[PDB]
Amino acid sequence: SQANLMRLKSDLFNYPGPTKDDPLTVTLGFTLQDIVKADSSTNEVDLVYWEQQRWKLNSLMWDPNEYGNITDFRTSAADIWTPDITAYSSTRPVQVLSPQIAVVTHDGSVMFIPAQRLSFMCDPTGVDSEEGATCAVKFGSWVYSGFEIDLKTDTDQVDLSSYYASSKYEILSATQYKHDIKYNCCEEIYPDVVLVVKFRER
Amino acid sequence: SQANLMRLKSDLFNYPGPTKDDPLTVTLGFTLQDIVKADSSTNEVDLVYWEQQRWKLNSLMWDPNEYGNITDFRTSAADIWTPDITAYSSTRPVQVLSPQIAVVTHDGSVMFIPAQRLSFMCDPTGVDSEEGATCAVKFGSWVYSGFEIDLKTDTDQVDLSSYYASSKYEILSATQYKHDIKYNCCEEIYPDVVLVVKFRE
Amino acid sequence: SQANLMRLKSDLFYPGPTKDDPLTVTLGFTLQDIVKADSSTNEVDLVYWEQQRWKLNSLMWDPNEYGNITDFRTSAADIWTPDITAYSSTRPVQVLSPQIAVVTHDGSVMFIPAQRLSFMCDPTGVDSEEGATCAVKFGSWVYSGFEIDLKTDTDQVDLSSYYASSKYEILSATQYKHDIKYNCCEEIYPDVVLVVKFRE
Amino acid sequence: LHSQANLMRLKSDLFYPGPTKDDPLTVTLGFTLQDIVKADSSTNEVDLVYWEQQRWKLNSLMWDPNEYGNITDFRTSAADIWTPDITAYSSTRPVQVLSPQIAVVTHDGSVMFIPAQRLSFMCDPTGVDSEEGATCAVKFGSWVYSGFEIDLKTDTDQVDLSSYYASSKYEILSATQYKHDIKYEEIYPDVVLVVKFRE
Amino acid sequence: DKLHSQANLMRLKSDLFNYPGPTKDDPLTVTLGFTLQDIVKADSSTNEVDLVYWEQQRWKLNSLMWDPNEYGNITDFRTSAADIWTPDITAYSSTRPVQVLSPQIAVVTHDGSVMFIPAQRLSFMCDPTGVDSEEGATCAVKFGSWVYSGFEIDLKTDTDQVDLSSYYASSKYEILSATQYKHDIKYNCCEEIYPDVVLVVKFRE
Numbered sequence A: 001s002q003a004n005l006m007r008l009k010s011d012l013f014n015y016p017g018p019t020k021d022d023p024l025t026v027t028l029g030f031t032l033q034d035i036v037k038a039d040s041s042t043n044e045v046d047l048v049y050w051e052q053q054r055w056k057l058n059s060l061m062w063d064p065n066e067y068g069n070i071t072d073f074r075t076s077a078a079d080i081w082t083p084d085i086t087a088y089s090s091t092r093p094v095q096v097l098s099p100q101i102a103v104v105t106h107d108g109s110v111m112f113i114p115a116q117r118l119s120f121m122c123d124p125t126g127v128d129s130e131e132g133a134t135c136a137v138k139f140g141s142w143v144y145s146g147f148e149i150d151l152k153t154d155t156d157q158v159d160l161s162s163y164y165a166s167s168k169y170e171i172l173s174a175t176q177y178k179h180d181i182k183y184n185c186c187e188e189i190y191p192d193v194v195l196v197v198k199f200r201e202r
Numbered sequence B: 001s002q003a004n005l006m007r008l009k010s011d012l013f014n015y016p017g018p019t020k021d022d023p024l025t026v027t028l029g030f031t032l033q034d035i036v037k038a039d040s041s042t043n044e045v046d047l048v049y050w051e052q053q054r055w056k057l058n059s060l061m062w063d064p065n066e067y068g069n070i071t072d073f074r075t076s077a078a079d080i081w082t083p084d085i086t087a088y089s090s091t092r093p094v095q096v097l098s099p100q101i102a103v104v105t106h107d108g109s110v111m112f113i114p115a116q117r118l119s120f121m122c123d124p125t126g127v128d129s130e131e132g133a134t135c136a137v138k139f140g141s142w143v144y145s146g147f148e149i150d151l152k153t154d155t156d157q158v159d160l161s162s163y164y165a166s167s168k169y170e171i172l173s174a175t176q177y178k179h180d181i182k183y184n185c186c187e188e189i190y191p192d193v194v195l196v197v198k199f200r201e
Numbered sequence C: 001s002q003a004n005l006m007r008l009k010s011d012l013f014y015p016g017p018t019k020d021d022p023l024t025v026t027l028g029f030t031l032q033d034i035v036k037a038d039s040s041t042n043e044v045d046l047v048y049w050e051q052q053r054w055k056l057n058s059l060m061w062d063p064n065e066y067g068n069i070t071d072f073r074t075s076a077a078d079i080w081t082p083d084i085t086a087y088s089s090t091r092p093v094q095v096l097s098p099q100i101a102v103v104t105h106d107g108s109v110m111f112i113p114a115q116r117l118s119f120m121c122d123p124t125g126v127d128s129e130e131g132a133t134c135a136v137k138f139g140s141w142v143y144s145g146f147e148i149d150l151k152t153d154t155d156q157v158d159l160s161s162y163y164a165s166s167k168y169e170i171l172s173a174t175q176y177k178h179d180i181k182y183n184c185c186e187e188i189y190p191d192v193v194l195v196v197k198f199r200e
Numbered sequence D: 001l002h003s004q005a006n007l008m009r010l011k012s013d014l015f016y017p018g019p020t021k022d023d024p025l026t027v028t029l030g031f032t033l034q035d036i037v038k039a040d041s042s043t044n045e046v047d048l049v050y051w052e053q054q055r056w057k058l059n060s061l062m063w064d065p066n067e068y069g070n071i072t073d074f075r076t077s078a079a080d081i082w083t084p085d086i087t088a089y090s091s092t093r094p095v096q097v098l099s100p101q102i103a104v105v106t107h108d109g110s111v112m113f114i115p116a117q118r119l120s121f122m123c124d125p126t127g128v129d130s131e132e133g134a135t136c137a138v139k140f141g142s143w144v145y146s147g148f149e150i151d152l153k154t155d156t157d158q159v160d161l162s163s164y165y166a167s168s169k170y171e172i173l174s175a176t177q178y179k180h181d182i183k184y185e186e187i188y189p190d191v192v193l194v195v196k197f198r199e
Numbered sequence E: 001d002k003l004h005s006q007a008n009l010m011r012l013k014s015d016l017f018n019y020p021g022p023t024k025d026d027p028l029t030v031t032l033g034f035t036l037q038d039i040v041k042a043d044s045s046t047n048e049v050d051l052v053y054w055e056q057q058r059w060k061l062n063s064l065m066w067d068p069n070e071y072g073n074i075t076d077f078r079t080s081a082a083d084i085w086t087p088d089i090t091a092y093s094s095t096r097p098v099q100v101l102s103p104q105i106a107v108v109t110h111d112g113s114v115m116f117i118p119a120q121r122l123s124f125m126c127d128p129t130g131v132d133s134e135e136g137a138t139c140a141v142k143f144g145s146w147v148y149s150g151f152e153i154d155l156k157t158d159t160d161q162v163d164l165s166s167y168y169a170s171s172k173y174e175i176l177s178a179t180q181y182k183h184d185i186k187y188n189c190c191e192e193i194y195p196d197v198v199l200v201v202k203f204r205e
């Protein structure tokens, strides 16, 4: 079985990114673990979250019958192409908290779920009130337009089922709606997923 | 002997990770050096510990008689596969405080003991009291279920034998119980080792 | 299509400019936010996007020879990129976006890294109606105007993404094309000067 | 086109194990002090921003411009070449580089490298809030080479203050870069930056 | 003469570089000494203290031996620490990753001895209580190989005294005493004994 897995990986590794004629659908979903801190002197808020990314490539397909019934495998994210999904309003480089390892399945679908800590632009005024503070952060491909990476979601709600119950901040709502925007630099429209979080001091 | 060691290393390096058909047992244990800080403005606590990891691979076996009676060697952890054991509630990238070097023994067993500083989600309310504060952080594989990586411990007690005697925080209790969790949704069993620390000023 | 793109990239894969092959580099700033202003050290921190454009003959192709591919994306480390540097930073610049460029069939490259910069700036007056004014120059570290001809498309900094709830509001943001020369020597050193007037 | 081809050819033709007692290298140092960012009296650390000019010359980097289309100099990554190990003796944090790591090589074989850096070094800022000010010093020299191997020179005793930030928290009263030798048979040279400054 | 010396050095380096670590049958002696430059700060809110020091490391390998006559009488040379094996001497009680302050360059001598002296800033567990009193505070920090036992790396000192001759005269903290003593310790993880050099510093404001 180990020999079969090594052979399968060797065959697969022995993708130039999407194109307008071969666009890629990337599904995005956010799980918000915690709101670590809010800095009212700089309007920066720190969040810990899991960013679930899923896409499918014909080049990553295989027949499990030809490889000892291997249905899927784990591999370093550096072994494959991954989408350049970026927070648009970070104020510090995003910090990764989990192994960079993807799960590839025989139908060519890949699931990547890195855990990260992000500092982003957010005014926490009103967090010390019952109505709380509201902030947003956009996520999208930095360089690929809607014609190359089509960006989708499975749900309009951020997954709060793992939110740290003793966080300094409690979540009032958290949504993840898709938006289409045009930037001054380029004519083509760029899709994005915007996380809108309403939160308050616990 | 030096030539024998280089030959052994060359032969060994000239593993794809575990599978359901070829699963791997990883033994985990913690030595808690110190609780550096507790931050009640963010509910983050910072620990320094040694994370001892042990596992064993047939592909790393050899006969000492074939290599000058060498029974073990040291090698960079980048030369070998290592398990993806991760703290599930960290708030900052773990900081490595020791060389990334493993010890490999002729029976194929590997011993890795990185020293790290970890910031994790923890409410320190009560740390300034007699009963102290309590916090917990789960360790496990990020991508492997128990059908691929099985977790074991040699003991459910954290090694406190070198805990810093003049730390700002004294340890009331520290355990590393192992839990096998089966979700209602799926057949696979997920195992974790949970560090539970009770401490006070 | 994917095979055509791979063949094009292999075919394509520049020593940098010289006095006899000068390269025009166009610079433009999008100012996202003024994160902080530290009156104890006179340092101000900005987040901005630095749009860089240039064009190389060695990056041209005919889309008809490559399945009508007119552009592609590639890692910035696959290609030469200009050494544009803030001249009064006080900390290493921190990169906030993927280091990926857009190459177009006419040989033009577009690269827009997002960065956080700490630079020398006295914010005195930021708590008044007139606000504070600070400036920072951007330009090549090692190339004179004979090798890298630095240009702007406009002097108006793009404020369309400026963070509306920043601690600081922008009174004006201007990007000037400026150069310094020595009478003794022919060489001219150009820079783009970012001047920001802002207040609490 | 011809210039690009010639540059590529020149770089290939050219692509040094460092100096020795029998092949000593002159390294010329100069400082431009851009700013004194901060002074921390709780730890006696001061933070400076400066440009450190380094120049040296190697026979192995010479060429005839006539053979390469009148190319008289070129730019190259500092990792493509040997660089002197000049270091600050009293730094309290790793020096942070603020500029591209790129050097200029000229056809006579001389190399010029001017990294911009932010440095935290040991310094008692006592007096900085007075008319007389504070005075601090930091020595620069090779970590591993003696004066028999790296002959450390300057073009001037004066730190270049023509770019000092006019609105710094700290104004400069004087800034010198005098040379010093220490004998313990080798002689060990340094260049000492001495800054006298005040709020 | 300069051309010949350069050629000789290049040839020597090429021959030398064209070591898998010590073994029980081929143990390595590593000599350690410390120079304490400054005690940058004491944090009583976390019991962390920050030190700047130089760590002098010396060892000797047969594979780095050469004849000076063979290569223009070249007694020694400088080379990047990345070109050679170096020992994994680690601070046992750091609270932050150690920060390197100097070039990583070693001096290799024709008898195969290496000398490597990185300058580092270290944050280590240390309670500074009493630093504001005449007796001062006292802290220790163990150094040793992380992974090689006494049977593979034998750890020695040249002296019991930490070199204070470069200590920063205007530090916030003055040194009352500083010693470096060797100890042999048994750890729970392994049967074999592991040696260490412990730095014991008494200091005050």
Ligand SMILES: O=c1cccc2n1C[C@@H]1CNC[C@H]2C1
Binding pocket: A141, A142, A143, A144, A183, A185, A186, A190, C100, C102, C111, C112, C113
């Ligand atoms: O670098 C590129 C490359 C292509 C397009 C863009 N940029 C970066 C910004 C964020 N994404 C949309 C737009 C502006």
Ligand SMILES: O=c1cccc2n1C[C@@H]1CNC[C@H]2C1
Binding pocket: B103, B112, B113, B114, E145, E146, E147, E148, E187, E189, E190, E194
């Ligand atoms: O990683 C190893 C490998 C071998 C032995 C040890 N460890 C690390 C700790 C520090 N050194 C002694 C002991 C415990």
